[PDB]
Amino acid sequence: MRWENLFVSGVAAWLPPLSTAQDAVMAGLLDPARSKLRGIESVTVASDAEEDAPPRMAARAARAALGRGDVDPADVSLVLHSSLWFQGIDLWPAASYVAHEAVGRHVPAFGLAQRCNGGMGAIELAGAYLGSGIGAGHAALLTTGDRFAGPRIDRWNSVDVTMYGDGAAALVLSTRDGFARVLSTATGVDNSLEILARGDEPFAPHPVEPSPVADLGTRTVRGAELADLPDLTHRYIDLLVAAKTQALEDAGTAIEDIAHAVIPVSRRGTGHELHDLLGLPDERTSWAYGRTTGHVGAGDQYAGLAHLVENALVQPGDRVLLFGGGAGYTCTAAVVEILRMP
Amino acid sequence: MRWENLFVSGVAAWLPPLSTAQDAVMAGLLDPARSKLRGIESVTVASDAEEDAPPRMAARAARAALGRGDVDPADVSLVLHSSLWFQGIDLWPAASYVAHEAVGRHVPAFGLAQRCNGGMGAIELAGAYLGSGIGAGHAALLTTGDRFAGPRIDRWNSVDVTMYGDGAAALVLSTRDGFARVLSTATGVDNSLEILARGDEPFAPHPVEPSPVADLGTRTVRGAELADLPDLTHRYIDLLVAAKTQALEDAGTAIEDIAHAVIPVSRRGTGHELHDLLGLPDERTSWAYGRTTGHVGAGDQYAGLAHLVENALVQPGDRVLLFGGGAGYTCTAAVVEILRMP
Numbered sequence: 230m231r232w233e234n235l236f237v238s239g240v241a242a243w244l245p246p247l248s249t250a251q252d253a254v255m256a257g258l259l260d261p262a263r264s265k266l267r268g269i270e271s272v273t274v275a276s277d278a279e280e281d282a283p284p285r286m287a288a289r290a291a292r293a294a295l296g297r298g299d300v301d302p303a304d305v306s307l308v309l310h311s312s313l314w315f316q317g318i319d320l321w322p323a324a325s326y327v328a329h330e331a332v333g334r335h336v337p338a339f340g341l342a343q344r345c346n347g348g349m350g351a352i353e354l355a356g357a358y359l360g361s362g363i364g365a366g367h368a369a370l371l372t373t374g375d376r377f378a379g380p381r382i383d384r385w386n387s388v389d390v391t392m393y394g395d396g397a398a399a400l401v402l403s404t405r406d407g408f409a410r411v412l413s414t415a416t417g418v419d420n421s422l423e424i425l426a427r428g429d430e431p432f433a434p435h436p437v438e439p440s441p442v443a444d445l446g447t448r449t450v451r452g453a454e455l456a457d458l459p460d461l462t463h464r465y466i467d468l469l470v471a472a473k474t475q476a477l478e479d480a481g482t483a484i485e486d487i488a489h490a491v492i493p494v495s496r497r498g499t500g501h502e503l504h505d506l507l508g509l510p511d512e513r514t515s516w517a518y519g520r521t522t523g524h525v526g527a528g529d530q531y532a533g534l535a536h537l538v539e540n541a542l543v544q545p546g547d548r549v550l551l552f553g554g555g556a557g558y559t560c561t562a563a564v565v566e567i568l569r570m571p
Numbered sequence: 572m573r574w575e576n577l578f579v580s581g582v583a584a585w586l587p588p589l590s591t592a593q594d595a596v597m598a599g600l601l602d603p604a605r606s607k608l609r610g611i612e613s614v615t616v617a618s619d620a621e622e623d624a625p626p627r628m629a630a631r632a633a634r635a636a637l638g639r640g641d642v643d644p645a646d647v648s649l650v651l652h653s654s655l656w657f658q659g660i661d662l663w664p665a666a667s668y669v670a671h672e673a674v675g676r677h678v679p680a681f682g683l684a685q686r687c688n689g690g691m692g693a694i695e696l697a698g699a700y701l702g703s704g705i706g707a708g709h710a711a712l713l714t715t716g717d718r719f720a721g722p723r724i725d726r727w728n729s730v731d732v733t734m735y736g737d738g739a740a741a742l743v744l745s746t747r748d749g750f751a752r753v754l755s756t757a758t759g760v761d762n763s764l765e766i767l768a769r770g771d772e773p774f775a776p777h778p779v780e781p782s783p784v785a786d787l788g789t790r791t792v793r794g795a796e797l798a799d800l801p802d803l804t805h806r807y808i809d810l811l812v813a814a815k816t817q818a819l820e821d822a823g824t825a826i827e828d829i830a831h832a833v834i835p836v837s838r839r840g841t842g843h844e845l846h847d848l849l850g851l852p853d854e855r856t857s858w859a860y861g862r863t864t865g866h867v868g869a870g871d872q873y874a875g876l877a878h879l880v881e882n883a884l885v886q887p888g889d890r891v892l893l894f895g896g897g898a899g900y901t902c903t904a905a906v907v908e909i910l911r912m913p
Contacts, residue, residue: 329762335762336760353705361572361698378777440777
């Protein structure tokens with residue numbers, strides 16, 4: 230999609246303090262071979278106090294993003310809140326709370342699920358809503374938030390390719406104006422890969438109690454055995470490349486013209502990483518940052534963009550690739566152009 | 572919102588067998604006084620076999636709805652799957668499963684959370700998306716699905732105002748043609764009521780294990796107190812009336828021109844009901860149907876419309892009010908004109 234009239238007006242993360250991989254190793258929580266292989270130096274870890282429940286971290290991130298863009302809460306016509314896991318109370322609309330705390334009473338709010346890609350997919354959905362004439366305002370608030378805890382989540386081991394960080398991020402879109410122009414978005418998708426996110430886990434009628442520790446790595450191997458696909462790796466490569474190619478082409482931009490790619494926090498540790506597939510070096514991606522925070526739910530792309538702008542790592546005239554990807558397997562990419570520095 | 576080119580192409584529900592409140596009472600699961608007060612005759616109850624997990628009921632409803640409007644799966648550019656509760660496997664994109672099984676590999680799929688309003692809210696998000704030019708196809712697949720089980724859910728008691736029903740529903744939107752046209756949609760919202768849906772429940776770091784039985788009736792009562800608003804009742808009334816007024820207005824239609832309203836399944840057995848507020852008699856609502864299914868998660872409106880349509884209880888030229896409402900507190904309403912009969 231080529232966007233004629235879409236902007237990023239504000240962006241921010243609320244992250245708790247860093248907890249090092251060295252300390253996880255020393256506490257016997259993390260095998261050092263694994264620490265080294267995945268490259269993640271630290272992840273963000275919140276307290277178990279109620280103030281750090283994911284909808285409250287998101288509320289704080291949303292307020293910071295709205296304040297940094299000087300968008301008026303009264304002009305926000307939509308709230309989308311993306312997440313991966315428990316928001317702290319069940320049978321309850323977390324998104325309305327985020328909306329109520331950061332924007333107010335009369336804004337439609339939805340919870341959004343597209344695993345790790347929710348942050349990015351929310352941009353397409355919000356952008357479409359803002360163009361439609363359904364709501365009066367010119368802006369949409371997009372939030373993410375998670376806080377991982379045990380017994381179910383082991384942040385250091387429950388997913389093979391990454392380690393989970395706690396926290397929230399926020400991105401405000403406008404059809405009016407912003408510090409960055411969204412040139413394009415594009416989604417690559419291959420839903421046959423959903424099986425890799427369930428493996429041979431049975432469909433239970435109720436959550437399994439005492440929760441065993443999640444092992445999404447083991448799921449992918451049972452899933453790949455079950456799927457019996459001849460081109461499994463090629464499926465994943467093709468959707469990632471379709472997203473990259475279409476975002477860049479719709480934006481009249483080549484990869485050589487991308488100053489920075491903000492990417493999901495994940496790592497193989499040997500062989501080809503996502504940057505090799507994208508066609509740019511390691512140091513032109515958000516890796517140096519993401520490896521200090523871990524995979525902050527659906528929020529890596531917002532957080533990484535906030536890192537860039539806050540640390541003046543881009544200037545006007547630079548273009549940035551925001552690159553998603555989450556189990557499903559769905560990947561939404563965007564090309565943004567820096568117009569001015571807040 | 573007035574809609575110039577939005578249609579309903581297919582609608583379907585996949586519903587498991589009913590189970591009567593009488594049999595609930597005799598089995599010692601429901602007080603005879605409650606059963607009588609609420610007037611719900613029966614409710615849909617799925618088996619606990621894997622094949623009745625909600626995403627799989629949703630895939631089947633989706634396939635029935637796609638068949639009924641002769642929509643080619645290749646022309647579907649979005650899948651939105653709304654639910655209230657557990658989909659059978661955690662840390663996993665149910666929506667990509669519903670999309671893969673009913674449509675194919677290459678359509679972006681999202682899970683939506685807007686409690687009981689999800690079915691109706693999705694109509695607006697999907698309508699905007701179809702109109703935006705993001706995807707090449709002209710159709711959206713909207714699904715709902717849930718299957719309640721204990722120890723967390725007691726379908727007969729966990730909500731004062733209704734009794735939960737298992738099952739799924741599916742609604743296919745199109746921007747070129749359908750058996751019915753969407754004349755209007757409108758959303759009334761008041762996110763201050765979110766507190767009514769969490770009571771004094773604290774934010775927990777991890778889901779509370781052993782699950783105690785949910786009790787949303789008590790949440791409403793503790794929430795109301797904590798909130799200590801003087802006009803709690805009026806907030807709820809104005810957002811409902813506002814959804815009604817704007818839908819009717821944007822569709823150029825007065826309430827006495829609405830041949831049927833499909834409403835959420837619920838009831839206070841005395842005083843004003845929703846039909847009184849909407850200004851139409853009980854008999855011109857879906858109540859006579861809904862009291863035999865119970866509250867089918869976010870799918871009451873899709874299911875009730877399928878019922879109207881499959882039994883030829885409306886005719887070409889009839890206008891129907893679809894009326895949402897879910898905790899948050901968000902109410903999306905829609906006026907639909909039927910152009911022919913599938």
